[PDB]
Write an enzyme that holds these catalytic residues in place. Structure first.
Site, PDB file in Angstrom:
ATOM      1  N   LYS B 172       0.815  -1.183   0.000  1.00 13.21           N
ATOM      2  CA  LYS B 172       0.000   0.000   0.000  1.00 13.21           C
ATOM      3  C   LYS B 172       0.860   1.249   0.000  1.00 13.21           C
ATOM      4  O   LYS B 172       1.445   1.581   1.022  1.00 13.21           O
ATOM      5  CB  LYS B 172      -0.907  -0.009   1.219  1.00 13.21           C
ATOM      6  CG  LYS B 172      -1.869   1.163   1.287  1.00 13.21           C
ATOM      7  CD  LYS B 172      -2.277   1.444   2.703  1.00 13.21           C
ATOM      8  CE  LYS B 172      -1.689   2.720   3.215  1.00 13.21           C
ATOM      9  NZ  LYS B 172      -1.767   3.774   2.203  1.00 13.21           N
ATOM     10  N   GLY B 225       6.840   4.647   8.341  1.00 10.06           N
ATOM     11  CA  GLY B 225       5.926   5.742   8.574  1.00 10.06           C
ATOM     12  C   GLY B 225       6.145   6.317   9.936  1.00 10.06           C
ATOM     13  O   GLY B 225       7.093   5.987  10.580  1.00 10.06           O
ATOM     14  N   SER B 226       5.271   7.196  10.379  1.00 13.00           N
ATOM     15  CA  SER B 226       5.473   7.846  11.660  1.00 13.00           C
ATOM     16  C   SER B 226       5.474   6.876  12.823  1.00 13.00           C
ATOM     17  O   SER B 226       5.011   5.773  12.702  1.00 13.00           O
ATOM     18  CB  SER B 226       4.416   8.910  11.884  1.00 13.00           C
ATOM     19  OG  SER B 226       3.130   8.370  11.806  1.00 13.00           O
ATOM     20  N   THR B 227       5.951   7.345  13.961  1.00 13.34           N
ATOM     21  CA  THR B 227       5.865   6.603  15.186  1.00 13.34           C
ATOM     22  C   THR B 227       4.408   6.476  15.621  1.00 13.34           C
ATOM     23  O   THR B 227       3.994   5.439  16.093  1.00 13.34           O
ATOM     24  CB  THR B 227       6.673   7.291  16.284  1.00 13.34           C
ATOM     25  OG1 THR B 227       7.922   7.727  15.748  1.00 13.34           O
ATOM     26  CG2 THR B 227       6.933   6.356  17.447  1.00 13.34           C
ATOM     27  N   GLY B 230       2.532   3.833  13.791  1.00 13.05           N
ATOM     28  CA  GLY B 230       3.217   2.563  13.880  1.00 13.05           C
ATOM     29  C   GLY B 230       2.729   1.777  15.067  1.00 13.05           C
ATOM     30  O   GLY B 230       2.598   0.565  15.012  1.00 13.05           O
ATOM     31  N   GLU B 247       9.919   0.885  10.497  1.00 14.44           N
ATOM     32  CA  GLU B 247      10.850   1.983  10.439  1.00 14.44           C
ATOM     33  C   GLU B 247      10.098   3.269  10.743  1.00 14.44           C
ATOM     34  O   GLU B 247       9.336   3.743   9.928  1.00 14.44           O
ATOM     35  CB  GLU B 247      11.551   2.056   9.098  1.00 14.44           C
ATOM     36  CG  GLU B 247      12.741   2.986   9.111  1.00 14.44           C
ATOM     37  CD  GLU B 247      12.453   4.289   8.433  1.00 14.44           C
ATOM     38  OE1 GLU B 247      12.118   5.248   9.124  1.00 14.44           O
ATOM     39  OE2 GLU B 247      12.543   4.349   7.202  1.00 14.44           O
ATOM     40  N   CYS B 281      14.163   9.752   6.490  1.00  9.91           N
ATOM     41  CA  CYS B 281      14.276   9.494   7.915  1.00  9.91           C
ATOM     42  C   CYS B 281      15.730   9.455   8.379  1.00  9.91           C
ATOM     43  O   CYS B 281      16.023   9.696   9.548  1.00  9.91           O
ATOM     44  CB  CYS B 281      13.523   8.221   8.270  1.00  9.91           C
ATOM     45  SG  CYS B 281      11.752   8.382   7.922  1.00  9.91           S
ATOM     46  N   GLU B 381      11.027  14.884  14.743  1.00  8.40           N
ATOM     47  CA  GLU B 381      11.392  14.810  13.363  1.00  8.40           C
ATOM     48  C   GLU B 381      10.577  15.745  12.507  1.00  8.40           C
ATOM     49  O   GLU B 381       9.443  15.459  12.217  1.00  8.40           O
ATOM     50  CB  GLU B 381      11.213  13.395  12.853  1.00  8.40           C
ATOM     51  CG  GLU B 381      11.524  13.245  11.396  1.00  8.40           C
ATOM     52  CD  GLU B 381      11.316  11.855  10.890  1.00  8.40           C
ATOM     53  OE1 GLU B 381      10.436  11.167  11.387  1.00  8.40           O
ATOM     54  OE2 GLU B 381      12.021  11.455   9.971  1.00  8.40           O
TER      55      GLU B 381
END
Lengths: 487, 487
Positions: B172, B225-227, B230, B247, B281, B381
């Site tokens: 996706k 993707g983002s924390t 995730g 990640e 990242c 970030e």
């Protein structure tokens, strides 16, 4: 006998003095009361493990190895005390404590002691002028929640690899079977493990378990347990995205084909399901017999079952013992009841024994229930000396049955056909598959599940892979690097 | 321009016919409208992959390799097309799409096409009379969610290892940058990949993402993707306890020591954060300069930053393009504002380009902010062309700062001191560390995070490890043992 938390090199009670009764399955009498660790107690434990990580991960693979080796020896030296201790607390026949639990515990620790300095990084073929070398480092502080079926042996399994790799550990045995883990960490300091490198924190799952699976300083959570609690260990990991190892049960297919050696298969099946009172996720709890040998197999097997000497775990004569908790017994008797209402047909056992010496203990007779692959009890892990017999006609029917489950942990089959042996082992969805043998485990052989029985492996380099991280370093040595933005 | 979902070798609109606008970051005009997938379509996808799996995993490694190899070539043949397609959609300088994206995408697919028949199991030394071999099998149907920062390149990174190992994939991409992935899978069927082996299912995260992460038939979900999102892949994974790869971002330390080659360091630092508009990242978003060279450094770096050609991505002389989404833009500006409200001092940049010409696009000027380590733009970030500058005087200072973050993806430092270089690389809690270079990635060099930057690795044997399972097979051949129950 050690009954306290073990944190930063000392036995201490729970910060709040909580307690848990540790009972003996024989009779249900109290063994001792253990300090019950709670969320506070694991902060202390985790901080100690965190405190200890640097001098330990910096210790020299070999000196972490030499200690693990030392531990194996010490366990052996103390082998009768552990066995006794573990049987008394677990219900394991001490003939089982001595010959299985303790040696398997030593063997595993010895394996990982000689693993410690064999854990190697790699050097990568990258662009000219660069050096790319990738270490395998310890994760850091790792948490480990173990079940109660192999309290003593699972200290090796879990702690072997993690310690070899240099992680520090906060480990939570079950309130049920703590005692033998506690002695082991004392053996650990006896032999020179630095304080805080391992901390033992028995407690309820919702207190100690939870603090551990959600503690922000824990980098991994290793968990063997019920699928249900394992989803909860997964949801708790959200907290800091610690890595996870779940082993979440098995419904071990034990297939016996037309050309199996049925004497051997019978012995294997008996061992596979009745050893450890069936409290083993890799237990062969689903006998699957080819219609043309079923009756012959069942003649000897039920005989065998009916002849097993259930009794005092402390008797070197006891072949079976009680289940470990009274709850599990009930559970194993409810399952029996439900295998019965489902049309199941008890061939042996069926209920708790009758002897008066056994009436206080959590005993259940070596049950054997003929059924249909469909039945519940054939689909869910009854954690007891309880096998289901289903019968087949084609390799394909057998594969179908074997794979007709949500579980994937262990499997096994019995033939003499070369092809069939491999064709089935290859086709069964389990992490392991034994042929003409069962429940065969080695410290170097990756043990773990597939699908919903979990992910991650204990044993072998795999276990070590699970407890390390790849830390790639790049060195720009003689590399020509045009600026991305030309001047 | 393919703008539909790719399922079962078919481009098709979303079941519900739901659709998303795909916009140019340069002028915010409409490139096309993409079929927005949701739960329904990810079931069609996962179903297609499940159907495809058996024959694909049975392909025989060389044959999946041969297909990955053909894909690389094909990708290289359609290089300008892909390069133009990806720049248009993403905002990447076509000089980036053609020199970085495209070539790194093929490189990685090549790497893994040859990695396919090099994925080996092991034979374990077990007791005598036993044969223990452990295969590495594919998990099965793998779900992959990729971000919009390297739509094209990340197809190779995720799908390379997974396919090689024989999984089937439902990938996706983001609603934001699907177009490149869609052309790649056509590039795949173009080249011989079987239908249903890869299914592409662009959609919002809470629709097709959620549905992918929760799917019962998905055995692993890989997420970059983002924390934030995730934790909810993790919270979704419980459904079936599928394996996870995360990640989750980086706050890349780029340390510059006093005896660094400051021209090299400046070019590296500029590349480290301004390449791809800082949408990486592993971006070196945290410049940590030794107080003695910080002035010398900033002089050439700020002149660089300001010299950077921000503009039309389709100009091969554009050096930096726009951020790929208006929201990203808005957030980066917010960060800038908060970088400053915090007492930050912008040394270059600090807002969108005063260029009536770049007014419709989501451009942000290469930005450089002098800050403290405690500041938030220094801990969080940003994910744009944005570097914070902090100064230090000790190695130990520098280490502290580098590690004063929750992240741990990439890192880098600049020196000519041997010791220092390794000491620091070994002491920085990051998955990767570059010395006298930065953002250096190779298809064989494991790429991934540590701590809350996640776990799992892309690239290398490691990536392959993450997409296979240990299947341990035990064969009893020549040495048997005594009943557990001696008669």
């Amino acid at each position: 006998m050690q009954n306290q938390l073990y944190i930063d090199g000392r036995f201490v009670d729970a910060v709040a003095g909580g307690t848990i009764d540790v009972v003996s399955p024989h009779d249900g009498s109290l063994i001792t009361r253990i300090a019950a660790a709670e969320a506070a107690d694991v902060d202390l434990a985790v901080a100690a493990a965190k405190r200890a990580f640097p001098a330990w991960s910096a210790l020299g693979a070999a000196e972490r190895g030499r200690l693990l080796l030392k531990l194996a020896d010490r366990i052996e030296e103390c082998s009768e005390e552990l066995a006794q201790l573990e049987s008394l607390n677990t219900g394991h026949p001490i003939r089982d404590s001595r010959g299985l639990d303790v040696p398997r515990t030593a063997a595993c620790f010895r394996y990982f002691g000689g693993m410690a300095d064999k854990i190697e990084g790699s050097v990568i073929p990258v662009d000219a002028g660069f050096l790319n070398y990738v270490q395998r480092k310890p994760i850091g502080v790792v948490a480990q929640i173990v079940p109660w079926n192999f309290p003593l042996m699972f200290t090796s399994w879990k702690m072997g690899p993690a310690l070899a790799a240099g992680n520090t550990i906060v480990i939570k045995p079950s309130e049920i079977t703590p005692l033998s883990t506690l002695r082991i960490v004392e053996l650990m300091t006896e032999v020179g493990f630095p304080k805080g490198v391992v901390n033992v924190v028995p407690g309820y799952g919702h207190t100690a378990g939870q603090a551990l699976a959600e503690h922000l300083d824990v980098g991994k959570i290793a968990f063997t347990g019920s699928t249900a609690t394992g989803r909860r260990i997964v949801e708790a990991s959200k907290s800091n995205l610690k890595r996870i190892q779940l082993e979440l049960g098995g419904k071990g297919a034990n297939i016996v084909f037309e050309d199996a050696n049925i004497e051997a298969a019978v012995n294997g099946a008996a061992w596979a399901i009745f050893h450890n009172q069936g409290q083993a996720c890799i237990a062969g709890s689903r006998l699957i017999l080819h219609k043309d040998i079923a009756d012959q197999f069942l003649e000897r097997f039920i005989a065998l079952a009916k002849s097993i000497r259930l009794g005092d775990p402390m008797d070197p004569e006891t072949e079976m013992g009680p289940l470990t908790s009274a709850l599990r017994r009930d559970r194993v008797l409810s399952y029996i009841d439900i295998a019965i209402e489902q049309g199941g047909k008890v061939l042996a056992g069926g209920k708790a024994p009758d002897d008066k010496a056994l009436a206080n203990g959590f005993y259940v007779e070596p049950t054997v229930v003929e059924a249909k692959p469909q039945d519940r009890v054939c689909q869910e892990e009854v954690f007891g000396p309880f096998v289901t017999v289903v019968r087949f006609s084609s390799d394909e029917e057998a594969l179908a049955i074997a794979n007709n489950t949500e579980y994937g942990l262990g499997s096994g089959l019995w033939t003499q056909n070369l092809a069939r042996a491999h064709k089935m082992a290859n086709a069964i969805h389990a992490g392991m598959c034994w042929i003409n043998c069962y429940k065969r485990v080695s410290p170097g052989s990756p043990f773990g599940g597939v699908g919903q029985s979990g992910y991650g492996r204990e044993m072998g380099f795999e276990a070590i892979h699970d407890y390390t991280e790849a830390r790639s370093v790049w060195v720009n040595v003689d590399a020509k690097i045009a600026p991305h933005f030309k001047r």
